[PDB]
């Protein structure tokens, strides 16, 4: 029996900064050898879908893997929700930053939504070392099984 768990937020930050994932998701489920706190790199993995660019780690026991999929999402006017390729319908306006909630929609769980200004993200997850890139606003949302992220952009500058 396989289950899915959303990485803890600190793990998300570690992956964004170093492309290194920590094992032993918290109760604990060790991947192998019962040791933990090992910075494991993410491999480019094998192509699955024309859009997904999945980066995995593994490539009565319990096996733990750590995936970072860069999918594509779409939204329609007036941009009150967006749906990724693998389902994942989110009731958050893609251009909703952290001030314009009366000019954009936001209906997801307010206790699981985080926006970080000037966030640093590795250019490529596959490469063990990459040139860190700064983004004006990056929004994170924690779900039951995964955590979604998406750069926030001005509405009147990308939509016509």
């Amino acid at each position, epitope marked *: 029996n396989t289950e899915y768990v959303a990485p803890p937020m600190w793990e998300i930050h570690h992956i964004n900064s170093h492309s290194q994932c920590y094992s032993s998701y918290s109760f604990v489920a060790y991947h192998r050898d019962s040791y933990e706190n090992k910075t494991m790199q993410l491999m480019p993995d094998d192509y699955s879908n024309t859009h997904s660019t999945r980066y995995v780690t593994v490539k009565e026991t319990s096996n733990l893997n750590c995936m970072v999929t860069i999918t594509t999402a779409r939204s329609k006017y007036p941009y009150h929700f967006f749906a990724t390729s693998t389902g994942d319908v989110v009731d958050i306006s893609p251009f909703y930053n*952290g*001030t*314009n*909630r*009366n000019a954009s929609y*936001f209906g*997801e*769980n307010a206790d699981k*939504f985080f926006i970080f200004p000037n966030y640093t993200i590795v250019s490529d997850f596959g490469r063990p070392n990459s040139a860190l890139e700064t983004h004006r606003l990056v929004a994170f949302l924690e779900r039951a099984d995964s955590v979604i992220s998406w750069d926030i952009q001005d509405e009147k500058n990308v939509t016509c």
Partner: antibody
Amino acid sequence: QLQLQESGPGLVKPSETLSLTCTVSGASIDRSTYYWGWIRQPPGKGLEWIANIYYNGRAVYSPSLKSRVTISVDTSKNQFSLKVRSLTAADTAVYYCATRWNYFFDFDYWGRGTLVTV
Amino acid sequence: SVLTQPPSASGTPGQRVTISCSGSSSNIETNYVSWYQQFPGTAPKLLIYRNNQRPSGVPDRFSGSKSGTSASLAISGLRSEDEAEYYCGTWDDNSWVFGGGTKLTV
């Protein structure tokens, strides 16, 4: 388009508690809202935060008013009410119904407060 | 955990006014500090949400800074309509502590 209004009594006496109610229009209390709260202000004095309440019923009070203050929320009517016990002359103030709407802003929307004289 | 905000401040049109809030070093030090503007006889309004950034619609004349356990609100080019009561606000371990309240006078 959040809108907050108050419907508390205009006159009170120390012999009874004070019950205030804040009603929300243009939106609804739900898991998509961060928190609401009550902030009092004596005439000519500084603002005083009484307590905050969340959608799931969790309430965090101020240590100075924790004993004499209770707060509840009715999601069916999209309202939340505050009860203050053992009123004194110092409680004559304008009570505001504040909340958090935007992510960064914090205390952003302030309902038109009601004057209560002890 | 009061912020020991001064009772009032004075200034002249075209001048810069600085308002200072002194923190407990356990709430203002780390928890974000916000500045609120309240005209007399009406509910207050958010003026500076985070320590540095400025909300939409607020004039650029307002600025905020947080050095150590002290918070400073700077107003440049003082005007007639700027007269109001300015409040500090911050979190103290699940407790919101407003400032004392400064009545700006021109």
